[PDB]
């Protein structure tokens, strides 16, 4: 038994899924193989001990967020994203990217949406000058408002599966800290880029003037939020080699 660290097989596999005799995996496989070294993920394999609410407000001083980088590539990027009580990572989207999540500590509400794609199908519509939101909108932001669909609103644990998106399926999504602080490893292929044109997008699901799911939404993409952002500390796990 000479293994590498859960994390070296993780950055690894991402590697080799994100990037002839015999014939190494496929995309699928890869995939699968990924998602199976992630679903045994403890926040103790990161040497992070889970986190008890703190009983203060959050400051404006304080970030509600912080992100702990592990390892990237220009194939994907590896980090934790560790949530503060009462707070959210606010809805967005991934251009073009697959991701996997994984809860490390905490209970998370990921809402998982989707923008309405004419390539897979559908025939998004524009707003209709009729109907009208609380609040009211200016005139420019109707002309860019997207129909969408708000796909699924569950739960996730460190005992849950991880979750997925892919380009095209739950990419847009929203991420609420449930009832005390939360933690969850996080896989992003390709990384985001602001520089080079694939950024992280915000949007707000619009209320106009039945509960189900899946429904749709109307959609408007916004700046990041005054009091969200999300700042470093320290990873004390086991490092990605080289
Ligand atoms: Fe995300």
Redesign the pocket.
Known sequence: DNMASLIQRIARQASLTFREAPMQPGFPENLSKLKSLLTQLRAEDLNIAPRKATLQPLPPNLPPVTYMHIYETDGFSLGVFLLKSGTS?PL???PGMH?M?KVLYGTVRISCMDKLDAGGGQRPRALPPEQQFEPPLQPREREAVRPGVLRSRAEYTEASGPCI?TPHRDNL?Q?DAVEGPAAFL?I?APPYDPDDGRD?HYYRVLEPVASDLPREVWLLETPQADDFWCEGEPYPGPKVFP
């Open positions: 990572i967005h989207d991934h991701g999540l998106l999504h991420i996080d992003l992280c």
